[PDB]
Design an enzyme around this catalytic site. Structure first.
Site, PDB file in Angstrom:
ATOM      1  N   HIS A  44       0.802  -1.220   0.000  1.00  0.00           N
ATOM      2  CA  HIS A  44       0.000   0.000   0.000  1.00  0.00           C
ATOM      3  C   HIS A  44       0.838   1.275   0.000  1.00  0.00           C
ATOM      4  O   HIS A  44       0.318   2.338  -0.352  1.00  0.00           O
ATOM      5  CB  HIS A  44      -0.942   0.006   1.207  1.00  0.00           C
ATOM      6  CG  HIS A  44      -1.867   1.182   1.247  1.00  0.00           C
ATOM      7  ND1 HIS A  44      -1.678   2.250   2.098  1.00  0.00           N
ATOM      8  CD2 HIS A  44      -2.989   1.458   0.542  1.00  0.00           C
ATOM      9  CE1 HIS A  44      -2.643   3.132   1.916  1.00  0.00           C
ATOM     10  NE2 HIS A  44      -3.452   2.676   0.977  1.00  0.00           N
ATOM     11  N   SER A  65      -0.331   0.052  -6.873  1.00  0.00           N
ATOM     12  CA  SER A  65      -0.229  -0.976  -7.897  1.00  0.00           C
ATOM     13  C   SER A  65       0.312  -0.397  -9.202  1.00  0.00           C
ATOM     14  O   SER A  65       0.332   0.818  -9.415  1.00  0.00           O
ATOM     15  CB  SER A  65      -1.592  -1.624  -8.141  1.00  0.00           C
ATOM     16  OG  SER A  65      -2.168  -2.080  -6.930  1.00  0.00           O
ATOM     17  N   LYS A  71     -15.806  -4.494  -9.959  1.00  0.00           N
ATOM     18  CA  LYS A  71     -15.084  -5.259 -10.965  1.00  0.00           C
ATOM     19  C   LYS A  71     -14.570  -6.584 -10.421  1.00  0.00           C
ATOM     20  O   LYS A  71     -14.205  -7.464 -11.209  1.00  0.00           O
ATOM     21  CB  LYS A  71     -13.918  -4.433 -11.515  1.00  0.00           C
ATOM     22  CG  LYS A  71     -13.428  -4.879 -12.881  1.00  0.00           C
ATOM     23  CD  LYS A  71     -12.628  -3.783 -13.564  1.00  0.00           C
ATOM     24  CE  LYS A  71     -11.190  -4.208 -13.794  1.00  0.00           C
ATOM     25  NZ  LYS A  71     -10.733  -3.863 -15.167  1.00  0.00           N
ATOM     26  N   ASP A  72     -14.536  -6.744  -9.099  1.00  0.00           N
ATOM     27  CA  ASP A  72     -14.121  -7.997  -8.484  1.00  0.00           C
ATOM     28  C   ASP A  72     -15.278  -8.959  -8.262  1.00  0.00           C
ATOM     29  O   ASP A  72     -15.040 -10.151  -8.043  1.00  0.00           O
ATOM     30  CB  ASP A  72     -13.427  -7.723  -7.147  1.00  0.00           C
ATOM     31  CG  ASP A  72     -12.207  -6.837  -7.295  1.00  0.00           C
ATOM     32  OD1 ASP A  72     -12.031  -6.244  -8.380  1.00  0.00           O
ATOM     33  OD2 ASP A  72     -11.425  -6.730  -6.328  1.00  0.00           O
ATOM     34  N   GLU A 109       0.473 -34.673  -4.708  1.00  0.00           N
ATOM     35  CA  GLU A 109      -0.631 -34.042  -5.411  1.00  0.00           C
ATOM     36  C   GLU A 109      -0.114 -33.283  -6.631  1.00  0.00           C
ATOM     37  O   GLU A 109       1.079 -32.993  -6.758  1.00  0.00           O
ATOM     38  CB  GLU A 109      -1.399 -33.105  -4.480  1.00  0.00           C
ATOM     39  CG  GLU A 109      -2.337 -33.826  -3.521  1.00  0.00           C
ATOM     40  CD  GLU A 109      -3.704 -34.096  -4.125  1.00  0.00           C
ATOM     41  OE1 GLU A 109      -3.767 -34.660  -5.237  1.00  0.00           O
ATOM     42  OE2 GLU A 109      -4.716 -33.747  -3.483  1.00  0.00           O
TER      43      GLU A 109
HETATM   44  C1  HEM Z   1      -4.247 -22.287   3.376  1.00  0.00           C
HETATM   45  C2  HEM Z   1      -4.923 -23.043   4.248  1.00  0.00           C
HETATM   46  C3  HEM Z   1      -5.184 -24.564   4.093  1.00  0.00           C
HETATM   47  C4  HEM Z   1      -4.816 -25.418   3.119  1.00  0.00           C
HETATM   48  C5  HEM Z   1      -4.005 -25.133   1.835  1.00  0.00           C
HETATM   49  C6  HEM Z   1      -5.319 -26.731   3.465  1.00  0.00           C
HETATM   50  C7  HEM Z   1      -5.154 -27.881   2.724  1.00  0.00           C
HETATM   51  C8  HEM Z   1      -5.635 -29.129   3.052  1.00  0.00           C
HETATM   52  C9  HEM Z   1      -5.613 -30.299   2.201  1.00  0.00           C
HETATM   53  C10 HEM Z   1      -5.042 -30.359   0.769  1.00  0.00           C
HETATM   54  C11 HEM Z   1      -6.166 -31.313   2.869  1.00  0.00           C
HETATM   55  C12 HEM Z   1      -6.343 -32.745   2.318  1.00  0.00           C
HETATM   56  C13 HEM Z   1      -7.822 -33.090   2.190  1.00  0.00           C
HETATM   57  C14 HEM Z   1      -7.967 -34.337   1.359  1.00  0.00           C
HETATM   58  O1  HEM Z   1      -6.948 -34.789   0.776  1.00  0.00           O
HETATM   59  O2  HEM Z   1      -9.100 -34.876   1.275  1.00  0.00           O
HETATM   60  C15 HEM Z   1      -6.569 -30.825   4.174  1.00  0.00           C
HETATM   61  C16 HEM Z   1      -7.179 -31.550   5.176  1.00  0.00           C
HETATM   62  C17 HEM Z   1      -7.535 -31.072   6.418  1.00  0.00           C
HETATM   63  N1  HEM Z   1      -7.418 -29.765   6.850  1.00  0.00           N
HETATM   64 FE1  HEM Z   1      -6.749 -28.198   5.738  1.00  0.00          FE
HETATM   65  N2  HEM Z   1      -5.993 -26.637   4.663  1.00  0.00           N
HETATM   66  C18 HEM Z   1      -5.929 -25.323   5.076  1.00  0.00           C
HETATM   67  C19 HEM Z   1      -6.482 -24.818   6.231  1.00  0.00           C
HETATM   68  C20 HEM Z   1      -6.953 -25.567   7.285  1.00  0.00           C
HETATM   69  C21 HEM Z   1      -7.348 -25.053   8.578  1.00  0.00           C
HETATM   70  C22 HEM Z   1      -7.279 -23.555   8.952  1.00  0.00           C
HETATM   71  C23 HEM Z   1      -7.739 -26.097   9.332  1.00  0.00           C
HETATM   72  C24 HEM Z   1      -8.270 -26.132  10.786  1.00  0.00           C
HETATM   73  C25 HEM Z   1      -8.658 -25.051  11.465  1.00  0.00           C
HETATM   74  C26 HEM Z   1      -7.618 -27.293   8.526  1.00  0.00           C
HETATM   75  C27 HEM Z   1      -7.931 -28.571   8.935  1.00  0.00           C
HETATM   76  C28 HEM Z   1      -7.882 -29.702   8.151  1.00  0.00           C
HETATM   77  C29 HEM Z   1      -8.304 -31.032   8.539  1.00  0.00           C
HETATM   78  C30 HEM Z   1      -8.891 -31.432   9.909  1.00  0.00           C
HETATM   79  C31 HEM Z   1      -8.095 -31.848   7.504  1.00  0.00           C
HETATM   80  C32 HEM Z   1      -8.399 -33.359   7.457  1.00  0.00           C
HETATM   81  C33 HEM Z   1      -9.829 -33.555   6.971  1.00  0.00           C
HETATM   82  C34 HEM Z   1      -9.810 -34.258   5.640  1.00  0.00           C
HETATM   83  O3  HEM Z   1      -8.698 -34.500   5.105  1.00  0.00           O
HETATM   84  O4  HEM Z   1     -10.907 -34.571   5.113  1.00  0.00           O
HETATM   85  N3  HEM Z   1      -7.132 -26.935   7.286  1.00  0.00           N
HETATM   86  N4  HEM Z   1      -6.226 -29.488   4.248  1.00  0.00           N
HETATM   87  C1  HEM Z   2      -2.428 -15.579   0.272  1.00  0.00           C
HETATM   88  C2  HEM Z   2      -1.592 -15.137  -0.675  1.00  0.00           C
HETATM   89  C3  HEM Z   2      -1.614 -13.711  -1.284  1.00  0.00           C
HETATM   90  C4  HEM Z   2      -2.426 -12.665  -1.032  1.00  0.00           C
HETATM   91  C5  HEM Z   2      -3.607 -12.572  -0.039  1.00  0.00           C
HETATM   92  C6  HEM Z   2      -2.013 -11.563  -1.877  1.00  0.00           C
HETATM   93  C7  HEM Z   2      -2.576 -10.307  -1.937  1.00  0.00           C
HETATM   94  C8  HEM Z   2      -2.309  -9.407  -2.942  1.00  0.00           C
HETATM   95  C9  HEM Z   2      -3.243  -8.492  -3.571  1.00  0.00           C
HETATM   96  C10 HEM Z   2      -4.735  -8.332  -3.217  1.00  0.00           C
HETATM   97  C11 HEM Z   2      -2.579  -7.802  -4.502  1.00  0.00           C
HETATM   98  C12 HEM Z   2      -3.161  -6.721  -5.436  1.00  0.00           C
HETATM   99  C13 HEM Z   2      -3.471  -7.392  -6.775  1.00  0.00           C
HETATM  100  C14 HEM Z   2      -2.290  -7.290  -7.709  1.00  0.00           C
HETATM  101  O1  HEM Z   2      -1.613  -6.230  -7.690  1.00  0.00           O
HETATM  102  O2  HEM Z   2      -2.022  -8.258  -8.473  1.00  0.00           O
HETATM  103  C15 HEM Z   2      -1.207  -8.260  -4.508  1.00  0.00           C
HETATM  104  C16 HEM Z   2      -0.202  -7.799  -5.325  1.00  0.00           C
HETATM  105  C17 HEM Z   2       1.025  -8.398  -5.486  1.00  0.00           C
HETATM  106  N1  HEM Z   2       1.358  -9.666  -5.059  1.00  0.00           N
HETATM  107 FE1  HEM Z   2       0.218 -10.796  -3.822  1.00  0.00          FE
HETATM  108  N2  HEM Z   2      -0.940 -11.982  -2.635  1.00  0.00           N
HETATM  109  C18 HEM Z   2      -0.668 -13.292  -2.298  1.00  0.00           C
HETATM  110  C19 HEM Z   2       0.336 -14.062  -2.839  1.00  0.00           C
HETATM  111  C20 HEM Z   2       1.417 -13.583  -3.545  1.00  0.00           C
HETATM  112  C21 HEM Z   2       2.537 -14.367  -4.019  1.00  0.00           C
HETATM  113  C22 HEM Z   2       2.653 -15.890  -3.789  1.00  0.00           C
HETATM  114  C23 HEM Z   2       3.380 -13.539  -4.665  1.00  0.00           C
HETATM  115  C24 HEM Z   2       4.733 -13.836  -5.364  1.00  0.00           C
HETATM  116  C25 HEM Z   2       5.346 -15.025  -5.368  1.00  0.00           C
HETATM  117  C26 HEM Z   2       2.814 -12.206  -4.604  1.00  0.00           C
HETATM  118  C27 HEM Z   2       3.366 -11.063  -5.142  1.00  0.00           C
HETATM  119  C28 HEM Z   2       2.674  -9.900  -5.402  1.00  0.00           C
HETATM  120  C29 HEM Z   2       3.173  -8.715  -6.072  1.00  0.00           C
HETATM  121  C30 HEM Z   2       4.598  -8.523  -6.632  1.00  0.00           C
HETATM  122  C31 HEM Z   2       2.185  -7.818  -6.121  1.00  0.00           C
HETATM  123  C32 HEM Z   2       2.254  -6.408  -6.742  1.00  0.00           C
HETATM  124  C33 HEM Z   2       1.731  -6.468  -8.173  1.00  0.00           C
HETATM  125  C34 HEM Z   2       1.638  -5.075  -8.733  1.00  0.00           C
HETATM  126  O3  HEM Z   2       1.660  -4.106  -7.931  1.00  0.00           O
HETATM  127  O4  HEM Z   2       1.534  -4.932  -9.979  1.00  0.00           O
HETATM  128  N3  HEM Z   2       1.619 -12.271  -3.918  1.00  0.00           N
HETATM  129  N4  HEM Z   2      -1.077  -9.239  -3.545  1.00  0.00           N
END
Ligand code: HEM
Ligand code: HEM
Ligand SMILES: CCCCCCCCCCCCCCCCCC(=O)OC[C@H](COP(=O)([O-])OCC(O)COP(=O)([O-])OC[C@@H](COC(=O)CCCCCCCCCCCCCCCCC)OC(=O)CCCCCCCCCCCCCCCCC)OC(=O)CCCCCCCCCCCCCCCCC
Ligand SMILES: CCCCCCCCCCCCCCCCCC(=O)OC[C@H](COP(=O)([O-])OCC(O)COP(=O)([O-])OC[C@@H](COC(=O)CCCCCCCCCCCCCCCCC)OC(=O)CCCCCCCCCCCCCCCCC)OC(=O)CCCCCCCCCCCCCCCCC
Ligand SMILES: CCCCCCCCCCCCCCCCCC(=O)OC[C@H](COP(=O)([O-])OCC(O)COP(=O)([O-])OC[C@@H](COC(=O)CCCCCCCCCCCCCCCCC)OC(=O)CCCCCCCCCCCCCCCCC)OC(=O)CCCCCCCCCCCCCCCCC
Ligand SMILES: CCCCCCCCCCCCCCCC(=O)OC[C@H](COP(=O)([O-])OCC[N+](C)(C)C)OC(=O)CCCCCCCCCCCCCCC
Ligand SMILES: CCCCCCCCCCCCCCCC(=O)OC[C@H](COP(=O)([O-])OCC[N+](C)(C)C)OC(=O)CCCCCCCCCCCCCCC
Ligand SMILES: CCCCCCCCCCCCCCCC(=O)OC[C@H](COP(=O)(O)OCCN)OC(=O)CCCCCCCCCCCCCCC
Ligand code: HEM
Ligand code: HEM
Ligand code: FES
Lengths: 171, 122, 60, 86, 66, 245, 387, 51, 49, 48, 97
Positions: G202, G206, G228-229, G272
């Site tokens: 910020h 952008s 637009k979002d 995966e």
């Molecule tokens: C960026 C955030 C998260 C990602 C990328 C993520 C990703 C995953 C993935 C890929 C699985 C495998 C499910 C399957 O293969 O069927 C999983 C399972 C699970 N996650 Fe997450 N998760 C996130 C956040 C959370 C949070 C915040 C919680 C708890 C507060 C949570 C609790 C669980 C539980 C209990 C399972 C097992 C249930 C199941 O596999 O059916 N996850 N998660």
């Molecule tokens: C949970 C993950 C993320 C959130 C919540 C997030 C959030 C944001 C948002 C809302 C914007 C404004 C939209 C845009 O400018 O494209 C932004 C910009 C940006 N994000 Fe992310 N972002 C995430 C992941 C990432 C990752 C993984 C990367 C790089 C590996 C990244 C790099 C950037 C950059 C360089 C900008 C500036 C783009 C510009 O100003 O033109 N962000 N981010």
């Protein structure tokens, strides 16, 4: 606009209103369905009920069955025990309960069978008062199921059973 | 740091320049910033001290014209269009109106970059 | 009359706007439920349990 | 009030940090007077045609990737056969 | 039902070349295993011919299995 | 690797559950359940489908209760400890045929019959692979041999499966009177197994349609409103009056 | 002064969501951040709901998951939404990184935002593994066994770290307990790092597709970019609901519906799909330590980009070579994913080696050379126009 | 672990009238007095007084 | 407090497994929530409490 | 303590069963309590 | 300008910890906010580890806690510290109020 005013404003507001209506209709279902998972599941519901077939218990007999971890006895009282149970004064009991309203059918007495004092399993057809007797702490329950003497504070508990022909459902 | 383009090295040999002229013409046509009417010098970054100082040493008319060019380019980019074939930037107007000022500023900064490193050889 | 009365009634104050939105949502839920139930029922003809009961149950 | 921050490039409304402007005129119309979706299909079609024509070859030549995919799959399947082990 | 139709498409003119290849193999392999060798089989040609026969037979009999 | 060690590709079919709006054919489900009970429950196990899972899908409450009352189960301690038996109830799982994995391995040579609760979803091919496997027992080709106890099936990976041909002609007598052959019984039991894998198909497919319709209408309205509001920016006019000194 | 500019919390909301100058010509590729935030919120809520029915142990996790599926009220929606949203997260992450890479957004003054994004990407990758390893099916068990064994490549204390992470001598109850405990905590750290991402962004604003300064023309975010979002949000919803209600096990391999048998090794041990290219890069090198080093570098190389672009222009809009080479790199990435997914057969080894070589050459050799060439050609043509 | 004399609680209840010998793993920490109470209980068996 | 008297803030009726039949003599929460429990039991009515 | 929710006039004695996840304190109650106890301190930190 | 006054994150840290104008005569009863924050941090950190050995089930919860207490390395420290910190939290909360 190729027309007069006060027309496009109405159309735009109508589109916004339809947007909001459909969004709220979707959100209500989303919230309700995603929160209904916290209620009773099928596995828990399947264990809730209990069935007893009263046709296998003649007059003056006891059947012990399990219901949510608390055993419940059934007794097919003859008219005798019915009439002395109704004869006792309610106010004279340690815990004053009657018997006419204590059983839906006076010929069937079903109570939750755990000692009200410290949670032990009493023995029926015994005690000084001719009912259920607890040798864990030396207390006696009357034939009607209430407490007369001993360390037991209150009477026996009554389940919310229902009658369906020759089968009684407890729960 | 900073762009390291080596056109000066190439221009020493007229053979290379004569050979490479058509390729450069085709490349500049392909880059396609002229379709928006911009000059090449409007695309350089202005976020450091040198460029911000150089932009303050430009003639007023040049600054106003640059502002108009950038505004028109942005307005064109909003609605996804380009200027017609008659309003494209001609090669005559595609000159370097920013390189000398930036070079002067860099030379001044480089000038100071020496007194501090001065040592006494005795 | 015309389109002025519609603006005057519904989209004049915020409160009437929100009330109209909520009532319309309440009725639209029921409408969509009915439509999807009818579509699903007409989609499955002769391959549902209540439809195929008289082919198995009665001959016990 | 709080403190004097570092050197940035945004400021706020009024002091946006841009250059001094002169002789710029801007017009527009109220959204309740303009007809939406006017000049949509023609403009969109022309822009899409131009975009396909110009930036098309930069993407089309995903061209050799599919060919190498197909050739690799076919050769790998052929080598795992009766005549491939001869 | 399915076995009959599979046998019909086993000799129908849509899989004739693969059937010929399978027969040629079976002859060669039977002769070789009669001599004594045990380092050759054509489960692959049988695979091709069986896939042809199943492709013919399966859809045209799955519409009657009701 | 070699296709002999990978298995011949399965055969594609058409099922009622494949359609976008169709669900399940329940008569076929009942026939498949009967076939599984009378031909499969001897060796395979389905210890994830309760008796109450069947009421409303292939049976009624009274029929399910009467069927479940036949089998016997263990019912915990009583009074002075002890382990007694009780008649079945409507909340017990289907009885497994073998106590543990070791007994199952001992009974059937050295192979363990896999549990059939989630075997349709756990195989590369779905219903098609299983149906082609059940009806693919052919005579071995020239040059190949089979050890004692090993059978030939091209669809099985390796073309050697230790499961004698399970289904034969007129093995079961269906209630409705359908002529029970190997192919019809195989199709019905495949349908029943697929139902056992995902028993919530009907409800899920029912709600998906309404959700998709509502989302489509909302998306169209959102695009129109975005087009409407952004007009005073996409249709600006900029004129440059040159600032003559 | 209005209330929104006076009260502290309302001012905090207003400065970031209502009144914030933005470039007036940002395309539809700038909406993916809001989609990422929505997907993260959905994942947090769904995981919190799912944690109320899951028992983290060897002998009860799979049965608990099955009970969730077929006994808990509307549990199939919960599980399918969790899995499909976790899958969509990486798609939107890759699109975000592609947008940041194509337009040269790593250049100053937005380097800190780039570094924070890279850190967030690494944290998200780590979080995905623990999440998928929880159900304790065949692929989860074997993939965890293979991957957690990579910690032995460090010199000294080699197998000690593996034993400490395993909490024993093999994948058992303690490691599932550890993984379940850690999978709950990481998303909160990801959210905090996202807040840091936004607060770092910020301060300068952008960029725009043109690549020039946007201080001359700006519009507030409140009426224009909050509408637009919405289109992207509804499109993402229509995309995810089809998967959740018509193909819930879409990205899911057949070997993911069986109990974890520690005696039968599966034919293929793969993670995966969204982690496939890094697995291919790891498997390409015959050496062991070099494999993990290259796997780490494949994601750590994004921090070297700002000091590798010798271009006077900022972006690929007016860079003929960049437009070609970017799509070439994308095709190479897809080829790497395909090679990593499949068997390690004869020709596939050569194809994967060549793809890895090209992937590591693109970041290290091609970029400076073509940027220098473009600068030189443009400068020469401009210099040779008056005479 | 050390062998339990009874297989389950119901057998213990059946053997000793209707009582249930509590498990001794965490009894000292779970009684109002601990060591003093346990020792006094062990050494405090006396003939009842009149009445 | 953690090295010389860990269970010093803890009631003696907390080192026993939960028996759903054994009714404890006194049912009280921890000490930091005690005054509100005292206030609750004062009012004879239920909802008013 | 959980029974105190029954004082609500209309939906009383139903919120108690919804929170219990059954008819008495059992496995679902402990699971929900563990999840909520894990979640809440982060909200407390944000409020601080 | 100092770096602590320029970098946004360092500026956030500085404005709240390094250079913040405060009254010059606040007594020792103003020291409980930091104590509360430290107690909360200790509670969260210790609970994260405590969640690594706990099985949330009514039938199997007490034995898991006992295994934590008497089988894991220095598990008694974790359990006692969590309980006693949760107790001290309320003492400091009452003092703050
Ligand atoms: C960026 C955030 C998260 C990602 C990328 C993520 C990703 C995953 C993935 C890929 C699985 C495998 C499910 C399957 O293969 O069927 C999983 C399972 C699970 N996650 Fe997450 N998760 C996130 C956040 C959370 C949070 C915040 C919680 C708890 C507060 C949570 C609790 C669980 C539980 C209990 C399972 C097992 C249930 C199941 O596999 O059916 N996850 N998660
Ligand atoms: C949970 C993950 C993320 C959130 C919540 C997030 C959030 C944001 C948002 C809302 C914007 C404004 C939209 C845009 O400018 O494209 C932004 C910009 C940006 N994000 Fe992310 N972002 C995430 C992941 C990432 C990752 C993984 C990367 C790089 C590996 C990244 C790099 C950037 C950059 C360089 C900008 C500036 C783009 C510009 O100003 O033109 N962000 N981010
Ligand atoms: C992965 C790959 C994609 C990743 C990300 C790529 C971009 C992100 C996609 C966002 C889509 C945004 C968009 O175009 O929609 C808003 C867009 C409005 O944009 P805008 O404000 O005009 O400016 C942007 C222009 O589109 C710009 O116009 P232009 O001059 O640049 O020309 C381009 C023009 C091109 O136009 C044409 O060439 C068509 C001409 C006739 C139009 C036909 C009507 C289409 C509806 O674009 C369109 O008209 C396309 C609109 C169709 C929307 C498609 C929705 C889903 C697609 C999203 C990704 C698909 C991936 C999934 C694949 C599925 C299977 C795997 O909506 C419309 O097109 C208006 C619809 C009007 C509805 C009328 C009914 C109302 C009832 C009352
Ligand atoms: C009527 C017939 C068909 C019409 C039906 C279409 C309806 C729905 C489609 C929506 C649509 O086209 O309009 C929305 C959208 C609205 O326009 P806009 O967003 O306001 O305009 C954006 C710029 O002005 C556009 O600027 P530009 O065109 O001057 O620049 C070229 C443009 C793209 O244009 C092209 O050059 C290709 C398009 C050529 C069209 C087809 C040619 C085939 C021959 O550049 C980009 O936007 C590239 C994005 C950069 C990165 C994103 C993707 C990277 C993926 C990441 C890979 C893995 C990550 C690695 C990192 C990880 C390592 C650790 O239109 C477009 O932008 C169209 C361009 C393609 C994007 C959408 C693609 C979806 C499928 C359409 C295929 C086209 C056929
Ligand atoms: C004779 C020769 C030797 C004598 C030695 C005797 C042995 C004592 C050993 C000394 C160890 C103590 C440490 C020490 O001296 O330094 C700390 C402290 C140093 O003071 P400071 O750092 O300058 O700041 C305090 C000012 O002096 C301010 O002082 P001040 O002049 O304003 O005096 C006012 C004082 C009044 O003076 C006294 O009371 C002191 C009288 C006896 C002195 C101590 C002897 C014991 O009260 C206060 O300090 C205000 C109290 C603050 C309120 C917060 C606490 C309330 C607790 C909340 C309860 C529950 C709330 C329910 C919430 C509901 C929610 C639903 O020494 C004190 O004078 C502390 C006084 C605190 C009184 C505690 C009453 C307990 C009885
Ligand atoms: C935590 C509580 C949630 C939050 C729940 C409440 C907040 C709703 C979320 C969207 C908030 C949008 C705020 C837009 C600013 C606003 O409130 O203006 C009201 C607009 C109409 O405003 P207008 O265009 O200027 O016309 C009005 C003309 N007058 C009457 C003034 C003469 O009218 C509208 O904006 C109607 C929008 C749709 C309202 C119907 C409810 C749908 C949202 C609730 C269900 C979905 C929830 C999704 C949550 C992710
Ligand atoms: C349940 C979830 C949604 C629950 C409800 C969610 C929405 C809550 C309200 C929206 C967010 C709060 C409003 C923020 C903007 C604001 O502060 O408006 C207050 C205005 C005056 O604000 P102003 O324009 O700045 O003028 C004052 C300027 N002076 C004179 C001080 C210099 O004064 C006014 O005219 C209106 C004051 C109203 C203050 C809020 C009252 C709380 C809402 C009551 C419930 C409304 C009915 C709800 C029906 C759904
Ligand atoms: C509060 C924040 C989330 C809500 C707002 C999200 C935006 C909603 C936009 C509209 C989408 C839904 C339209 C279809 C409505 C419908 O018809 O749903 C119909 C079905 C049930 O039908 P029935 O039982 O009533 O049939 C009655 C039988 N006669 O429900 C559903 O499919 C479940 C909802 C899935 C929709 C996807 C939601 C994705 C958001 C993330 C997941 C939720 C996060 C956690 C929330 C606690
Ligand atoms: C629980 C009831 C709480 C109340 C009623 C409360 C209220 C207050 C008030 C009124 C002040 C300002 C006092 C003054 O300026 O004279 C204050 C200060 C402060 N509070 Fe709280 N607060 C509470 C809990 C907390 C918690 C849980 C934390 C941290 C986790 C915290 C951290 C602080 C800090 C750091 C200060 C400033 C320094 C100090 O006063 O010690 N407070 N609080
Ligand atoms: C991330 C933060 C936290 C986590 C993961 C967590 C986790 C846990 C766990 C797993 C237990 C079970 C103890 C056992 O099995 O022996 C427990 C107990 C407990 N927690 Fe926490 N907790 C957290 C924060 C807190 C906070 C903030 C408080 C109070 C303000 C608190 C108060 C308690 C209390 C009183 C107990 C019971 C004491 C005991 O078991 O002897 N916890 N916690
Ligand atoms: S159970 Fe306590 S004396 Fe009867």
């Amino acid at each position: 606009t190729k027309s007069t005013g006060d027309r496009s404003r109405v159309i735009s507001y109508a589109m916004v209103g339809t947007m909001g209506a459909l969004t709220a209709a979707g959100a209500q279902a989303t919230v309700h369905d995603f929160l209904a998972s916290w209620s009773a599941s099928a596995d828990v519901l399947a264990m809730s009920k209990a069935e007893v077939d009263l046709s296998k218990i003649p007059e003056g007999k006891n059947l012990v069955v399990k219901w949510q971890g608390k055993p419940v006895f059934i007794r097919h009282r003859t008219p005798e025990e019915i009439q002395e149970a109704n004869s006792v004064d309610i106010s004279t009991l340690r815990d004053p309960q009657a018997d006419s309203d204590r059983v839906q059918k006076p010929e069937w007495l079903v109570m939750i069978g755990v000692c009200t004092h410290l949670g032990c399993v009493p023995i029926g057809e015994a005690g000084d008062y001719g009912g259920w007797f607890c040798p864990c702490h030396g207390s006696h329950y009357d034939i009607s199921g209430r407490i007369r003497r001993g360390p037991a504070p209150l009477n026996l508990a009554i389940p919310a059973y229902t009658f369906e022909g020759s089968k009684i459902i407890i729960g | 740091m900073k762009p390291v383009s080596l056109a000066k090295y190439i221009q020493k040999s007229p053979f290379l320049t004569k050979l490479l002229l058509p390729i450069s013409n085709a490349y500049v046509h392909l880059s396609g910033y002229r379709k928006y009417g911009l000059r090449y010098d409007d695309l350089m970054l202005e976020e450091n001290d040198d460029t911000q100082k150089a932009l303050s040493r430009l003639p007023k008319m040049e600054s106003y014209d640059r502002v108009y060019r950038i505004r028109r380019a942005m307005q064109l980019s909003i609605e996804n269009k380009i200027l017609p074939k008659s309003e494209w930037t001609k090669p005559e107007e595609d000159y370097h109106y920013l390189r000398p000022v930036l070079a002067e500023v860099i030379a001044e900064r480089k000038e100071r970059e020496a007194f501090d490193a001065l040592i006494v050889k005795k | 009359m015309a389109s002025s009365t519609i603006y005057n009634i519904f989209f004049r104050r915020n409160s009437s706007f929100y009330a109209t939105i909520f009532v319309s949502a309440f009725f639209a839920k029921i409408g969509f439920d009915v439509f999807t139930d009818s579509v699903w029922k007409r989609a499955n003809a002769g391959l549902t349990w209540d439809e195929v009961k008289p082919r198995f149950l009665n001959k016990d | 009030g709080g403190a004097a921050g570092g050197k940035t490039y945004l400021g706020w409304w009024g002091h946006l940090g841009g250059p001094k402007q002169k002789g710029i005129i801007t017009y527009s119309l109220s959204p309740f007077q303009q007809r939406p979706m006017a000049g949509f299909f023609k403009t969109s079609t022309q822009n899409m045609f131009r975009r396909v024509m110009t930036e098309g070859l930069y993407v089309a030549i995903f061209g050799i990737a599919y060919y190498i995919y197909c050739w690799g799959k076919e050769r790998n399947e052929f080598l795992n056969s009766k005549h491939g082990r001869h | 039902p399915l076995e009959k139709m599979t046998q019909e498409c086993m000799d129908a003119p849509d899989c004739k070349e693969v059937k010929h290849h399978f027969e040629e193999c079976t002859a060669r392999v039977t002769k070789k295993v009669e001599q004594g060798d045990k380092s050759e089989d054509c489960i692959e040609e049988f695979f091709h011919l069986y896939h042809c026969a199943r492709d013919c037979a399966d859809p045209k009999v799955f519409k009657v299995l009701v | 690797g070699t296709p002999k060690e990978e298995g011949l590709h399965f055969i594609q079919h058409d099922w009622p559950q494949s359609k976008v709006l169709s669900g399940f054919d329940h008569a076929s489900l009942r026939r498949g359940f009967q076939v599984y009970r009378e031909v499969c429950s001897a060796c395979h196990s389905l210890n994830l489908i309760a008796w109450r899972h069947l009421v409303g899908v292939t049976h009624t409450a009274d029929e399910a209760k009467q069927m479940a009352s036949e089998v016997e189960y263990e019912d915990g301690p009583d009074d002075e400890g002890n382990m007694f038996k009780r008649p079945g109830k409507l909340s017990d799982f289907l009885p497994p045929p073998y106590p543990n994995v070791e007994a199952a391995r001992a009974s059937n040579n050295g192979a363990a019959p896999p549990d059939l609760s989630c075997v349709v979803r756990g195989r590369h091919g779905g219903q098609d692979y299983i149906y082609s496997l059940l009806t693919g027992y052919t005579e071995p080709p020239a040059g190949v041999e089979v050890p004692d106890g090993m059978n030939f099936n091209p669809f099985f990976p390796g073309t050697q499966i230790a499961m004698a041909r399970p289904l034969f002609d007129d093995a079961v007598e269906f209630e409705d009177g359908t002529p029970a052959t190997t192919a019809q019984a195989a199709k019905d039991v495949v349908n029943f197994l697929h139902w056992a894998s995902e028993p919530e198909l009907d409800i899920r497919k029912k709600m998906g349609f309404q959700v998709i319709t509502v989302l489509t209408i909302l998306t169209a309205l959102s695009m129109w409103y975005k087009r409407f509001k952004w007009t005073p920016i996409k249709n600006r006019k900029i004129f440059y009056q040159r600032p003559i000194k | 002064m209005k209330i929104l500019k006076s009260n502290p919390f309302l001012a905090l909301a207003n400065n970031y969501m209502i009144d914030a100058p933005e470039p007036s010509n940002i395309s539809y590729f700038w909406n993916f951040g809001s989609l990422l935030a929505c997907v993260l919120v959905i994942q947090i809520v769904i995981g919190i709901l799912l944690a109320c029915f899951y028992i983290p142990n060897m002998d009860l996790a799979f049965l608990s998951v099955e009970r969730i599926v077929r006994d808990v009220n509307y549990g199939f929606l919960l599980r399918a939404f969790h899995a499909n949203g976790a899958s969509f997260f990486f798609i939107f992450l890759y699109l975000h990184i592609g947008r940041g890479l194509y337009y040269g957004s790593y250049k100053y003054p937005r380097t800190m935002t780039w570094n924070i994004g890279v850190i967030i990407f690494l944290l998200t990758i780590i979080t995905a593994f623990l999440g998928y390893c929880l159900p304790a099916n065949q692929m989860s068990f074997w993939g965890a066994t293979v991957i957690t064994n990579l910690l032995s490549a460090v010199p000294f204390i080699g197998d000690d770290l593996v034993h400490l992470l395993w909490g024993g001598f093999s994948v058992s109850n303690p490691t599932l307990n550890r993984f379940f405990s850690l999978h709950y905590l990481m998303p909160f750290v990801i959210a905090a790092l996202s807040v840091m991402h936004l607060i770092a962004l910020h301060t300068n604003g952008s960029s725009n597709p043109l690549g020039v300064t946007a201080n001359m023309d700006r519009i507030p975010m409140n009426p224009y970019y909050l509408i637009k979002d919405l289109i992207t949000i509804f499109i993402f919803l229509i995309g995810i609901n089809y998967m959740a209600f018509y193909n819930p096990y879409g990205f899911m391999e057949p070997d993911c519906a069986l109990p974890a048998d520690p005696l039968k090794t599966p034919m293929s041990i793969v993670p995966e799909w969204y982690l496939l290219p890094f697995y291919a890069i790891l498997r390409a090198i015959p050496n062991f330590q070099l494999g993990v080093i290259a796997m780490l570098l494949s994601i750590l190389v994004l921090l070297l980009l700002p000091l590798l672009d010798f271009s006077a222009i900022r972006g690929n809009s007016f860079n003929p070579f960049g437009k070609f080479f970017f799509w070439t790199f994308v095709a190479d990435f897809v080829i790497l994913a395909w090679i990593g997914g499949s068997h390690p057969e004869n020709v596939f080894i050569t194809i994967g080696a060549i793809a890895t070589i090209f992937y590591f050459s693109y970041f290290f050799i091609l970029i400076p050379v073509y940027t220098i060439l473009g600068n030189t050609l443009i400068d020469l043509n401009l210099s040779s126009i008056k005479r």
